[PDB]
Design a protein around this ligand. Structure first.
Ligand code: ZN
Ligand code: ZN
Lengths: 152, 156
């Protein structure tokens, strides 16, 4: 397994902590110079905050852990293609690279509906690597929702 | 028939958002302010705090939206109107869309980064699960005037 896949495995572990809590299993880690300086998972329903996406939590924890808004040199690993809110946060925090697992054909804005991470009219663009452990990351979401309907 | 007059409701709310932007101004931030109203009352008010808190997501719209989510005990801000002095960026427009904020009223356009009309309009995206009603230009001159003052002093 490559370097990106290794770190996506830790984001996947985060995604499973969210499934444990009955959240959509989406996980994220933030890496600078080989160290995971923050990790987080979706908390939208446990905390009832529309903003508690895995990418926003890890970014805010990174900023707080580091005492800076500018996460220069950070790579964000997330199991799913960021939404526009999270893609915006990546741009605003100057994250250098985003690696995601599965594409989000419904709502992804780092390659599918649009690419807010590579918008040249913005003051920052991030490298984007897609499909890293795609089958595991996407299958996790499918099985979560399939298990959800089962509970009726 | 009457001697007195009035502001519209929208510009009364907008001038509370301007008040918040003035606080941001005196702290040396980009002077952007915001209020969130539901059921006819202001539930949350905030201003830009990126430098004060060293958090990239401390935009006025993000703060008031999170405050309202936390206060209301729900991620869904149904019926809410967001007043912000400046056109929302993509992070905040996304957060509007995710929280089902019903309407966004903003003052001045952001020619460089606005994503509620200028570069794009994330608030009126058919392909998203939710669209917000957008009203621009409310107290435009006062809202844009602070930004242009801020960025003129930056140039100098
Ligand atoms: Zn997101
Ligand atoms: Zn913003």
């Amino acid at each position: 397994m490559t370097q990106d896949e290794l770190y996506m495995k830790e984001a996947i572990k985060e995604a499973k902590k969210a499934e444990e809590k009955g959240e959509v299993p989406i996980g994220a880690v933030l890496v600078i110079n080989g160290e995971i300086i923050a990790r987080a998972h979706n908390l939208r329903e446990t905390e009832q905050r529309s903003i508690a996406h895995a990418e926003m939590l890890v970014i805010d924890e990174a900023c707080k852990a580091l005492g800076t808004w500018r996460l220069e040199g950070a790579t964000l690993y997330v199991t799913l293609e960021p939404c526009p809110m999270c893609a915006g946060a990546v741009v605003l925090s100057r994250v250098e690279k985003v690696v995601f697992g599965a594409f989000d054909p419904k709502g992804g804005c780092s390659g599918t509906l649009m690419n807010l991470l590579q918008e040249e009219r913005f003051n920052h663009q991030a490298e984007v690597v897609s499909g890293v452990l795609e089958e595991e990351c996407g299958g996790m979401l499918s099985a979560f929702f399939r298990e959800l309907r089962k509970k009726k």
